[PDB]
Structure to design on (48 residues):
């Protein structure tokens, strides 16, 4: 993940990307549940 510096740019945040890469591990051995979500996706053509 990236954090917004006061300089205005987006550089690597180590604290939130630790949380994001934990959820990718928890969602890999267990799964991710989206029950209760209404999603609209466009451009979801075949082979994409």
């Amino acid at each position: 993940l990236k954090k917004k510096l006061p300089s205005g740019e987006w550089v690597f945040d180590r604290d939130t990307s630790a949380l994001f890469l934990d959820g990718l591990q928890k969602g890999a051995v267990n799964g991710i549940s989206y029950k209760g979500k209404n999603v609209l996706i466009t451009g979801a053509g075949a082979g994409s």
